Design a protein around this nucleic acid. Structure first.
Ligand SMILES: [Mg+2]
Ligand SMILES: [Mg+2]
Ligand SMILES: [Mg+2]
Ligand SMILES: [Mg+2]
Ligand SMILES: [Mg+2]
Ligand SMILES: [Mg+2]
Ligand SMILES: [Mg+2]
Ligand SMILES: [Mg+2]
Ligand SMILES: [Mg+2]
Ligand SMILES: [Mg+2]
Ligand SMILES: [Mg+2]
Ligand SMILES: [Mg+2]
Ligand SMILES: [Mg+2]
Ligand SMILES: [Mg+2]
Ligand SMILES: [Mg+2]
Ligand SMILES: [Mg+2]
Ligand SMILES: [Mg+2]
Ligand SMILES: [Mg+2]
Ligand SMILES: [Mg+2]
Ligand SMILES: [Mg+2]
Ligand SMILES: [Mg+2]
Ligand SMILES: [Mg+2]
Ligand SMILES: [Mg+2]
Ligand SMILES: [Mg+2]
Ligand SMILES: [Mg+2]
Ligand SMILES: [Mg+2]
Ligand SMILES: [Mg+2]
Ligand SMILES: [Mg+2]
Ligand SMILES: [Mg+2]
Ligand SMILES: [Mg+2]
Ligand SMILES: [Mg+2]
Ligand SMILES: [Mg+2]
Ligand SMILES: [Mg+2]
Ligand SMILES: [Mg+2]
Ligand SMILES: [Mg+2]
Ligand SMILES: [Mg+2]
Ligand SMILES: [Mg+2]
Ligand SMILES: [Mg+2]
Ligand SMILES: [Mg+2]
Ligand SMILES: [Mg+2]
Ligand SMILES: [Mg+2]
Ligand SMILES: [Mg+2]
Ligand SMILES: [Mg+2]
Ligand SMILES: [Mg+2]
Lengths: 150, 138, 128
RNA sequence: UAGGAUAGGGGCCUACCAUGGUGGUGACGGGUGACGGAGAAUUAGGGUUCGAUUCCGGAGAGGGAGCCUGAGAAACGGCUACCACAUCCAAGGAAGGCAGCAGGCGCGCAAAUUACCCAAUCCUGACACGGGGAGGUAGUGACAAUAAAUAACAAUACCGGGCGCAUUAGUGUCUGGUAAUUGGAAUGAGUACAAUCUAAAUCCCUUAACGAGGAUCCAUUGGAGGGCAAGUCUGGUGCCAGCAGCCGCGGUAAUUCCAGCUCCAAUAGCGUAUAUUUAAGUUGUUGCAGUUAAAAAGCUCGUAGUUGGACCUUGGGCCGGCCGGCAUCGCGCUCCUAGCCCGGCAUCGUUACUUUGAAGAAAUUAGAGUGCUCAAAGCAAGCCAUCGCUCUGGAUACAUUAGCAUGGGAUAACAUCAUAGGAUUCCGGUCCUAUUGUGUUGGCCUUCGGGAUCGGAGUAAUGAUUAAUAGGGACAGUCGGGGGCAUUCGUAUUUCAUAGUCAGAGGUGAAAUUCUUGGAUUUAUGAAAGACGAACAACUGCGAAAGCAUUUGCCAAGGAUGUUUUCAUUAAUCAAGAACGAAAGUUGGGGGCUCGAAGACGAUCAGAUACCGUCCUAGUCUCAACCAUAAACGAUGCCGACCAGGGAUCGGCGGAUGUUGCUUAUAGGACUCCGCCGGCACCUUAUGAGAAAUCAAAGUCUUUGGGUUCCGGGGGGAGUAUGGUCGCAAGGCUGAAACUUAAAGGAAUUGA
RNA sequence: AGAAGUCCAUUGAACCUUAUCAUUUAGAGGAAGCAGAAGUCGUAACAAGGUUUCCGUAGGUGAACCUGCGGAAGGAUCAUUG
């Protein structure tokens, strides 16, 4: 179930059996590479990029068309973000919650939720230090956290 | 439920160690208060008879249970000892040496005698059994 | 919350006890397949199939109606060729039938082949 | 670091310098009625308890301390000093050390002779010879242990049953027997010549002669209601005396006391007290429990700890009779082993696990052999012609953990290919060592060898498993009485105002206190105040729980659904630690309608410090700070899997024609039908479980093992005392013992 | 060669002063718990126990107990479309 609730939903995506790109997909690996880098340099993270290529340009999945995960594409071209995507978004939500909290100090539900989000941040940061995607010295300040993102 | 991990030996062993204190027999033998008891971890003890008192029996019965209050030689404590037989109280005299034992039940009162867990077994170096059965006299 | 070879064997006991002819094990592994081979070679199940859609896997087993109980010894103890005897007394209904499955550097195999080949290992489960 | 000291390493000690070292994997401290081990008791297995004591190791010689001699001592049957104690004295002085053997006193529940000897085993000295309270011998010795008497046989008999006639008897079978019936045979308990034993004796084993009629050569300890084997027999006593582990017995007809008889069990032994094991699956790893019997923390987060999804060939064959030896598309060898160009080579990831081996004291345990007459034992003995000696034995095994080595590489750990700093048949370069060409010694160096640096051509299939009905994150349309701030509204209640009316109004089972012609209650319009949010409103929603119900706006948050988006194991549960936590309560401001602890009255009553009625204080509301508890309940922790049928319902999605008082047409909103996820629940049913009540999870349990946290061990004493800690306080958390008691308790049944 | 004596060191028993720990022992006075027995006052609970019972908290009273606030059913209601 959910890490920080009692929800037990199973809604998610189901990729097909077929690994290869569909018959009707005619675009070549270099053009898709070019679209990915173009959207990246514009500031889109791999999830938004994948949503774009699914929606506009009729790419089901890049790993089926090009053979390489989109993050690996962004890394090879030196364009992956410094703070991983999910940690980036957790940091941004924690900052939003804290900013809300200084304006409502008796809103204890948001204090509970802030604790939950910082817990999630610490767990994901533990993972990232362990697997060498962050410096072994990166640590999360409540104070100087808005400078990093947004 | 119970911990089952392969690397859980400390948890199981420490848990048993903590929980054994919840058991009255273990705690009775491992806490040390038996050395504070009259006999101080002994089967028998010798004493001097201080007086003869006589005690009633509890409700379902009705009788006078004839006991002698003794002072233990080894530690100076004062206890009451039942004198088991018909007429054996008349063997007991004042200020004579007497050998006392437990009543059974290991320090807990026996039968209908209230608060008595000791019994007289020898007087003046001679058995109450031999005096009640006329085998020897004092 | 998952440690398979318990869900597989317990799904099989439940299905066999209801008299079903087909059972389906969602997460598979080589350990499960190796166990099921011992089951078949000793005669307690019919043939079975791996369905690979892609993932961990999936298998369907054909139940012959002769298995009574098959379970796992999770907390897989270390089990040498001399204390085989005492595990099988603790765990099998008699000296005549039933098998304890042990994983050994010579593969996964039942306790009798282990006695013959003179190797110990770690206990996985039993069936009888 | 350098010394000094020691036989020697070393903070062992000195000088100087650095600031370390151990600790929730439990340091440091405390208890031990604690010398450690080999081992002991009980043991289905797993375990529990014990180990002062004869073997090994350590330590001490009244308590400490210091020493000499010596190879070896911090020696005590050596010394010196002190402390404790104590002895002889001619009063100046002298001598002390039994936790050696025997013995004495004391302490006690608790333990032997002030004996003989070196003869055995061994040690010791100058030593074949001396010595040995080591050690042996005897004595005391129901500590434990072994064997084994107290009678056997015959016919008689009043008889007593089957089997011969079984009819109708009568006796006769194995003798079953009250039979102090009759009869001899047998024998060692005892006594003792003798021999033997022994160092001398003694005991045993042999043995002359004595030694058995059943009153004696005389068997006891406990019992006879149940548990539990064996009297509804006879006297006594009368809830007394007494018994009774427990239940119980005894109050004038005692199966239970006191006795007799009789019977029962064990038997040279049996009872009792205390400790301990078993029973005890009532400590539970194997293997117990936690809805209601004792027992899920109020709730969530969270570190250590424990636990952790799937994935990378030994798969397809030959080969000889369970395995070797090969071959497929087996990263190499100079050097050790090296077949007649040939298997089977060593370092360029570690462990757990398993296999085999070595090395492991004896005694004990298990166990092979062996007729101490058997046995407990012991390590002997057995044959010879039981004749100048033959054959001998004195096995073997177990030994957890740790350490050493050997094969295996499934299972599981820990380390880790995306910066190619990768490997690579080869080419020389920065530079040194130097061998057989130095028969001598070496000594810088030409082709040459080696580090190792090192610019490039080389080759290659050149190098990153998948995307969990695990998890996180993004996106889409939603949904909710989830939270916070501001804002909107409603009638009601109380008070006042204005107007009208006149006797009652209120409250109750009935009354009274209360208000009232300064007009109560009622009516009508309006204003102020504070609280509350009816009806809708539900076997419905949201929230971690406590909890959340007027509108609208803003702020952040959230579950579920959808998804051919993203990351890739990031996870589950949690000591320490942390957020929230009804009501009441505390401190201070604000407020102060209603209701209302306390209080004051009215009733009721035997009383009524209550229920009922009236007036009311704190409080109830709000802000700032505390508090941390509830039947905080689903009396049911969380995560995962499987397991039965059905209809409803809330959210989301998908698919259906067929209708709307909807909609420029459609789509959509409202309704109907079907399906899939996710909730709150409900109904019927065992093939299940349970002590049942009951439960589709309280099922998948003696056929017992998915992971993890908390927590129980008869009832009380008692959530008490004490110590700690938090709090302003009230109190919260943590949390005993003495003593006491045979039931307390759960579910269901029949009655009342 | 060398005794008595002596000087400084060193090991250091033993004694003294304070502190501190740890263990046993006295106490005016107070306040508990238990057991027992024919005492006293009431009626708290078990039936709707005669005011349903109980849990937290707070106050009050000869005593059991009563009352306010919030909660539970272990209730005396599994039930309103009637
Ligand atoms: Mg799930
Ligand atoms: Mg969690
Ligand atoms: Mg007990
Ligand atoms: Mg040195
Ligand atoms: Mg000691
Ligand atoms: Mg001692
Ligand atoms: Mg010794
Ligand atoms: Mg010594
Ligand atoms: Mg002494
Ligand atoms: Mg000495
Ligand atoms: Mg001596
Ligand atoms: Mg002596
Ligand atoms: Mg007798
Ligand atoms: Mg008797
Ligand atoms: Mg009996
Ligand atoms: Mg009987
Ligand atoms: Mg008795
Ligand atoms: Mg009774
Ligand atoms: Mg009896
Ligand atoms: Mg009798
Ligand atoms: Mg139990
Ligand atoms: Mg109860
Ligand atoms: Mg309970
Ligand atoms: Mg953790
Ligand atoms: Mg996934
Ligand atoms: Mg008026
Ligand atoms: Mg609703
Ligand atoms: Mg409303
Ligand atoms: Mg009052
Ligand atoms: Mg509580
Ligand atoms: Mg509870
Ligand atoms: Mg709960
Ligand atoms: Mg729906
Ligand atoms: Mg549904
Ligand atoms: Mg118990
Ligand atoms: Mg208890
Ligand atoms: Mg009942
Ligand atoms: Mg009364
Ligand atoms: Mg009365
Ligand atoms: Mg009441
Ligand atoms: Mg009453
Ligand atoms: Mg009442
Ligand atoms: Mg009631
Ligand atoms: Mg009152």
């Amino acid at each position: 179930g959910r890490m920080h609730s009692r929800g037990k939903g199973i809604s998610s995506s189901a990729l097909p059996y077929k690994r290869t790109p569909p018959s009707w997909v005619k675009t070549a690996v270099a053009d898709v590479d070019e679209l990915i880098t173009k959207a990246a340099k514009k500031g889109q993270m791999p999830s938004q990029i994948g949503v774009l290529l699914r929606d506009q340009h009729g790419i089901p999945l890049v790993k089926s068309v090009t053979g390489s995960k989109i993050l690996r594409i962004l890394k090879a071209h030196g364009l992956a973000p410094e703070i991983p995507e999910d940690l980036y978004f957790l940091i941004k939500k924690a900052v939003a919650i804290r900013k809300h909290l200084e304006r409502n100090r008796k809103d204890k539900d948001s204090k509970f939720r802030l604790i939950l989000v910082e817990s999630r941040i610490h767990r994901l940061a533990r993972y990232y230090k362990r697997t060498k995607k962050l410096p072994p010295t990166w640590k999360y300040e409540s104070a100087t956290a808005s400078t990093l993102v947004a | 439920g119970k911990t089952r991990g392969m690397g859980a030996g400390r948890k199981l062993k420490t848990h048993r160690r903590n929980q054994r204190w919840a058991d009255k027999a273990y705690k009775k033998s491992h806490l040390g208060n038996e050395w504070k008891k009259p006999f101080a971890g002994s089967s028998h003890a010798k004493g001097i008879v201080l007086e003869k008192i006589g005690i009633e029996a509890k409700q379902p019965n009705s009788a006078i249970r004839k006991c002698a209050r003794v002072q233990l030689v080894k530690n100076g404590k004062k206890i009451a000892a039942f004198v088991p037989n018909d007429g054996c109280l008349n063997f007991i005299e004042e200020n004579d040496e007497v050998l006392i034992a437990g009543f059974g039940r290991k320090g807990h009162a026996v039968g209908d005698i209230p608060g008595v867990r000791f019994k007289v077994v020898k007087v003046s170096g001679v058995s109450l059994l031999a005096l009640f059965k006329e085998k020897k006299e004092k | 919350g998952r440690r398979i070879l318990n869900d597989a064997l317990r799904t099989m006991v439940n299905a066999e006890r209801r008299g079903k002819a087909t059972a389906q094990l969602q997460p598979i592994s080589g350990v499960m397949i190796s166990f099921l081979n011992i089951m078949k070679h000793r005669g307690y199940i019919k043939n079975f199939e791996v369905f690979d859609p892609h993932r961990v896997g999936k298998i369907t087993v054909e139940l012959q109606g002769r298995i009574k109980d098959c379970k796992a010894l999770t907390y897989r103890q270390d089990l040498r060729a001399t204390e085989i005897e005492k595990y099988r007394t603790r765990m099998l209904p008699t000296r005549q039938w039933g098998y304890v499955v042990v994983t050994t550097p010579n593969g996964v195999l039942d306790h009798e082949e282990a006695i013959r080949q003179n190797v110990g290992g770690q206990v996985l489960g039993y069936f009888h």
